[PDB]
A = this chain, B = another copy of it.
C-alpha cells in the first residue's frame, strides 16, 4: 500500500523487465487518478503496457479519457478491462456483452482497445520479443 513496499517495487521495476501497470478508474472526489511509477522508471514508455481496471462503474466518457490519452502516450498502448464453474468463459461473456451498453464510447473504430483476449495476445507478442 504505502511505499516502503515501494522500495521493493522500484527495484524490481528498474531492470529491463516488461512492466505491466494497472490503474483503478474511478473517483468520488475529483475523480480517478492514473499511473505514475511506470513513467518514473520508464520515461519513453517503451517497455511498459497499461491496464485500466474497475472500469465497470464509470461513465464511458470516463473510459475514453482513460483508455485513450495522448497526454501520456506509450508504445504497446493501454488495455481497459473489467475483471471480477466455468468462470473463465463467463468473464469472457461479460466483456463481450458490456461494451454494448456504451458501444460508441468504447467499440469499433474507437481508438481504445479492450477485453482480456486482445490484451493476452499483446502480452504474448511483447514477451516473445523482449
Contact = CB atoms under 8 A, between A and B. Distances in A.
Contacts of A4: 71
Interface residues of A, number: 31
A23 interface: yes
Given A2-B71, A39-B3, A26 B23 contact: no
A26 to B, nearest CB: 4
A25 B35 CA distance: 15
A54 interface: yes
A1 interface: yes
Interface of A: 1-4, 6, 9, 21-36, 39, 53-54, 57, 69-73
26 contacts: A1-B29, A1-B30, A1-B72, A2-B33, A2-B69, A2-B72, A6-B36, A23-B27, A23-B28, A23-B29, A24-B25, A24-B27, A24-B28, A24-B29, A24-B31, A24-B32, A25-B26, A26-B32, A26-B57, A27-B32, A27-B33, A27-B54, A28-B53, A30-B34, A31-B33, A33-B33
